[PDB]
Symmetry: D3
Subunit: 266 residues, 6 copies
Amino acid sequence: MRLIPLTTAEQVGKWAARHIVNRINAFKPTADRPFVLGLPTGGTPMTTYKALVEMHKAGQVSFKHVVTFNMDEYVGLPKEHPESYYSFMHRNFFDHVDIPAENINLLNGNAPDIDAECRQYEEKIRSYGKIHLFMGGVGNDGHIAFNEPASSLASRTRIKTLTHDTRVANSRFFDNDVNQVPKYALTVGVGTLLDAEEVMILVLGSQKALALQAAVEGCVNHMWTISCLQLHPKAIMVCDEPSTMELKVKTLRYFNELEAENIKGL
Amino acid sequence: MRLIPLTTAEQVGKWAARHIVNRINAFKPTADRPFVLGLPTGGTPMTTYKALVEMHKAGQVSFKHVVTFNMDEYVGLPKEHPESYYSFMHRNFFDHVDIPAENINLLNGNAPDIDAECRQYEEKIRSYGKIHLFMGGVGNDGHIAFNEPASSLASRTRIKTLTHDTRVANSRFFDNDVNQVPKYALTVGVGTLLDAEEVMILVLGSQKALALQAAVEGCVNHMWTISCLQLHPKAIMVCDEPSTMELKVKTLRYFNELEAENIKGL
Amino acid sequence: MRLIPLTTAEQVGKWAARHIVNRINAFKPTADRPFVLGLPTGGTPMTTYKALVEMHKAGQVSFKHVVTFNMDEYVGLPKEHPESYYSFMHRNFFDHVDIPAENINLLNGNAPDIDAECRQYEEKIRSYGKIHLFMGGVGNDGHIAFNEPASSLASRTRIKTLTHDTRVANSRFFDNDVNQVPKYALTVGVGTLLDAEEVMILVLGSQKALALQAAVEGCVNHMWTISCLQLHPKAIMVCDEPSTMELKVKTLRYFNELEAENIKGL
Amino acid sequence: MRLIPLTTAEQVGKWAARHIVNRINAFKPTADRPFVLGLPTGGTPMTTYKALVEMHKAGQVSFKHVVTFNMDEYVGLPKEHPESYYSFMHRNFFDHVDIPAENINLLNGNAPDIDAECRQYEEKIRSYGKIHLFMGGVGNDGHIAFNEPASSLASRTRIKTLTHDTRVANSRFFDNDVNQVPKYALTVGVGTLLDAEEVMILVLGSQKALALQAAVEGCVNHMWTISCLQLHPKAIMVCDEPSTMELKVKTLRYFNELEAENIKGL
Amino acid sequence: MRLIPLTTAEQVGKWAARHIVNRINAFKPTADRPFVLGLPTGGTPMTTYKALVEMHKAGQVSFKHVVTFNMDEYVGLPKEHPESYYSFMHRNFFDHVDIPAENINLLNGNAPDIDAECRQYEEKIRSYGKIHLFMGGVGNDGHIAFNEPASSLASRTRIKTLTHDTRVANSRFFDNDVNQVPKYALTVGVGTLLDAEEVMILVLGSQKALALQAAVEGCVNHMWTISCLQLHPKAIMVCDEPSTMELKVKTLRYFNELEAENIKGL
Amino acid sequence: MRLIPLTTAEQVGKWAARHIVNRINAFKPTADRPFVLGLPTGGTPMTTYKALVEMHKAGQVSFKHVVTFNMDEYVGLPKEHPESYYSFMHRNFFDHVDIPAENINLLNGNAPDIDAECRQYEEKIRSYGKIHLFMGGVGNDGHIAFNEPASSLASRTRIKTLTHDTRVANSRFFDNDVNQVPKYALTVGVGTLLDAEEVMILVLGSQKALALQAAVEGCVNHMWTISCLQLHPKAIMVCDEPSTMELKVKTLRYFNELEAENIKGL
Ligand SMILES: CC(=O)N[C@@H]1[C@@H](O)[C@H](O)[C@@H](COP(=O)(O)O)O[C@@H]1O
Ligand SMILES: CC(=O)N[C@@H]1[C@@H](O)[C@H](O)[C@@H](COP(=O)(O)O)O[C@@H]1O
Ligand SMILES: CC(=O)N[C@@H]1[C@@H](O)[C@H](O)[C@@H](COP(=O)(O)O)O[C@@H]1O
Ligand SMILES: CC(=O)N[C@@H]1[C@@H](O)[C@H](O)[C@@H](COP(=O)(O)O)O[C@@H]1O
Ligand SMILES: CC(=O)N[C@@H]1[C@@H](O)[C@H](O)[C@@H](COP(=O)(O)O)O[C@@H]1O
Ligand SMILES: CC(=O)N[C@@H]1[C@@H](O)[C@H](O)[C@@H](COP(=O)(O)O)O[C@@H]1O
């Protein structure tokens, strides 16, 4: 894997946005061949969405032929709720870019038949062929998407029960009221993510240091599902400074040597 | 994976038997489309076989269209020996249910050409397509079937040399005479097991606590082959109380929350 | 996996050479169906190449229908440099055996288009179908080929940046001048190696003890890429005495019991 | 050690306060033979101080002949400043009980000679003889007061440098401004603490779960200073529920069984 | 420490007995200056007691001036009861040697004041001065007598609660009925043991392999009490073959080389 | 502990030498009150001895009233022999400073009674009182002098057996012939070292990286004797850059911040 050792969240967002833009422009998407982009929500991707929107306004990128798939969504939460991932995505991205409504794909957390909703989501991805770039984040306990500890490393899209710690962490968005945080979520699986051509994970803060250590220096295991990246042929972790504190000196030294030239330029 | 935290061996057997029955009845097997069931031997599955037989006698299940494959068998041990897995299976299951003789598949530990015997076993499974549910147990040192420590995680059916500790453990069935325990066995491989649609492992006793910890909280590795379950899309571990002592409190708490409703009802 | 516990480097070379010879002669290669052999360089395979050459001179083996692929090569290093892997291979093997020039495949570390060179190398392997036996070694830090720490376990042939420690270790061949050691190399990937039918790794010296421990008793992880062997269906590690010092007593005992008969005979 | 597995911080405070009172009254302190109590600050001991104060108000305990020693203080900071441990101790405890000023001992951060003051503090403790009970908390990283990771396990009272993470954890009381949190502070040493007759550590919150695991199931090491308790003949850890989530099931089970009768009524 | 790598329990007993005799005769005890010997119970020391008794019968050693202290006893249990450590010690040792009753020290589980008795036991040891040699065993979980996991490494003689696993391990001598195995017992402490001039631990069986690994290669920690030996200036572990299986090859190799001449003739 | 993160061995030697001089001159030794200095041999302390000698030549320090004790020596080897620690100490230090012969203490490997000599060495140290500063190095496996893995953490001066790896590591000075490297040697103990008022360990080279990690981030254990420093109230590790590569980023970051002003000018 590649690990981009940056300093601030601002830099991480600019780097991630530029990488997405560069992939899209080199791909040259069309109506017959769209660029498929996987997306996450949360506080981590905020600076990236900001940079992407700016780049679009400047005419540096167009999403007219970009199809998106989000990694997850809360179950039972009204779609119109400000904290639903649907709301998050339109507010921070879709509302501001030229992406067609038919090109947007989100999991329906209120679908009557849960397994059916998830199965059709996988079918939708299959209709296109593959996700060219899936961007995501990592949980304090190492989850990728909502693939909580003890989730199959070959899992597909399905419903999952969030850990109490994940609910506490996410309660920051529900007025610090853990009881308002949904208990279940629909999430793409580890296998679903591994099927993507390229995976780019954003990592910010000291709160993510242990998870970054697990992803980079730890072993492949289903407790810290982010470790699945070790099995992916093209994974990139874009990190800020605080997030790298638990890595070994030689490890960070190596990544700094590799990316010295690829980090200076914004 | 799913982990069913039960209390006694009796409960484990009733839960496992019910799961098998439910899978079969929902599948609706026929002569053109049989339900393929993988089976284990040993002291662990005893209460499960007992429950299955009871359920059959009550007309709750029929094996007329169920095809079985056992995971292993001792090499060189006369088929008529009471401790051969062939004898174990007929005595505790086949003799008591309506399963056709042509539907039963067992490895011949006395075959003249070992590799040939194993190859044909894999071919037999392939003739059906796939094993819909493979039930098994776990060794004190973490083996699944007889895939002893340092067995390929992509192994196929083959002959294996048992560890001295495995022979000592199994000597309980040979009048506590380790020298009477066969040194070799034919066993389906880790890859063979991973090809099954669903894997259900029964775990009983304090003697299995370290192996359960390895399977659940440990890393993927070939020393404790049971760790392969982390790579399987549909694995279930059915455990008694003593077997969960080495897990973290938060881990058992999570599984208890998930299965609270699925455990009460027998 | 199989682990052959031998005593000296001489024995390791004789055992590895015999295994290669036996595989080739049983295969019976022809112009329509050649035997594809993957090869390494370095100080480790020296006694093996010596034994192979001797066996060829004695008429025990012919390479007329053997196609070879080397695992790596230094980038930017003149092909004519005595320490290039190209030079190493001709000097220690090709110059002494009846293998056709068209049957030899080596990565061109001075190719103008790096990704293109690597892609065509993979295509060349694909043209044959598969590598029947890939022989290699292991780095002090556990690398297989030049798949340095944090290399994808599903990687393909590509350019890699060597770790400072790898350069120091290899400096022994550049007059102990680390600054003369190339910084980059083209190397087959972990996935490339996993696609081989059989992988045989030679392990010599106390300097490799920690790497052997990682490969055998450690977990699957991308830091010690040699751990990928746990995912391979047919891997063999041929070791000398010093290299086994970090293994557990029971582990070495098991391998000694398994190979007792397969080690005496040269 | 003893570990008291309680549910809430309210229960922890009541248990800890009762223990202090029990020890004080059994000792029956006098002017010539005072009971010496070591004390901590921060949010952790809040429920204990409140409970202890109410016990005093009800006439169950008197501090007329109780001498106290606090574990730390800021250097060069005006004692009057609210963000001083002096201010904390008076506001939350001393202001509300009958302890004489001459019986209160706090490190003077404004001492003319630091190394002289710290020496004097140790001298003062020996002047009485020993601290009969030292109450404390534990940091997220396992620290005790200012004995940060890598502090000698035989350290005495001295000046110390705070970790960046510790400053961030305490910035909460500094208007979330880390720039206001002191970088140094006078603190009793690990050896100083170990010399106490009994040590009682309060553990509250999920943020302390890893530290508790290190203290209870980890090895003795100076990175997690709390591990020092394993070397003490009379240590007690009073915990709430979330702080115990990282412990093994059998560990928590053991302490629950042992203290079942000692936590009734809370 | 010294580790004596022997093969059978018979050899272990002969080596340990000879060591005790060697120490006793070199000391040359008298009425005013007795040799103080600490002793254990259970199945582990059986071959040692038998060998020691035969050495006495042959006139190679006398216990006329040897004072003994046993590590533990049950509380509130009639001394007369066969399942008492008093009964064990007499039946397997005292009944057969010339030690005077006044020289025998066993904790009185029927003491009117437990905390008073334990204190008296420590007092008795100091009355002589010190224990010159303390022989013991090790539990499957690393315990020593009743110093179960999480016992202070500086503990003194006191009352203690047995783990459920310990009770199960000893239920063998209680008709396999755990309900008959006492839940408590008076036991010397880890500190008590460390105060002995020399400590010799007997290690027998595969069931002790993990404990031996913890004692020899693990870190100092109170979960595996046997790790305390690393803090003692004169400790010796006398082991049989199966108990050494979890150690590293280099570890066992080291002790074999060191004691090669010291184990000849057994 | 304090860890001084320097870059080169030249800087390490200058820092360590200056520290020794600072301590000596602050102490102001006299005939009746000498400064006692513990010393090591090998390649590690070379830059320190050279720097110390130049400081003496410049008149910044005198050894007229400095008494020295070296950590070890070979047994039965002629003191005259060049490959003796006596010869090393004089050639690299004593020959160049004004220390009187009567102030030099080295273990006599040719003592008529070894156990008597070692006892005498400890006696000599106590005759002065204590060693004020003991300088040492660390072995690749964490050893200190001859306190090889599995040496008691409370060991005194005694005779010891070297590990095979230690002999190989030192064979460099023995014409690369391990057969010339002694198998035994008289050495001060871990307890002996811990009794010193201050301990300063020099750490140089990538070969010491794992040992440094064990000393700083590992747990107290007798396999890595250097871990004993965690139990000492005044330990200092002076390191070069490559020796710190296995430490965590946050660990090195902490020491760099702490010693930033203390390493300026080197
Ligand atoms: C309601 C709910 O939470 N259901 C999930 C199920 O969807 C998931 O498949 C399984 C764990 O398995 P996995 O993570 O390995 O798929 O756990 C639970 O049964
Ligand atoms: C007689 C016998 O025991 N043969 C087995 C072989 O069948 C197995 O393939 C290999 C280990 O490899 P695996 O577990 O990775 O297949 O070990 C031994 O050679
Ligand atoms: C010039 C160079 O060193 N390029 C390599 C690239 O080829 C490799 O793919 C990646 C790590 O990823 P991998 O080991 O997972 O492929 O690192 C670097 O970008
Ligand atoms: C100004 C300052 O911060 N001084 C401290 C010193 O007092 C302490 O002794 C040492 C760490 O060692 P310790 O924690 O092992 O004492 O670090 C620093 O030198
Ligand atoms: C009745 C009983 O079981 N009392 C013991 C006590 O004697 C012991 O001191 C403590 C554990 O601490 P220790 O093992 O560290 O002494 O546990 C229990 O309180
Ligand atoms: C001749 C010889 O090598 N004797 C040493 C002995 O002096 C040492 O005490 C012990 C290990 O124990 P220690 O390192 O814990 O003292 O090993 C050997 O018996």
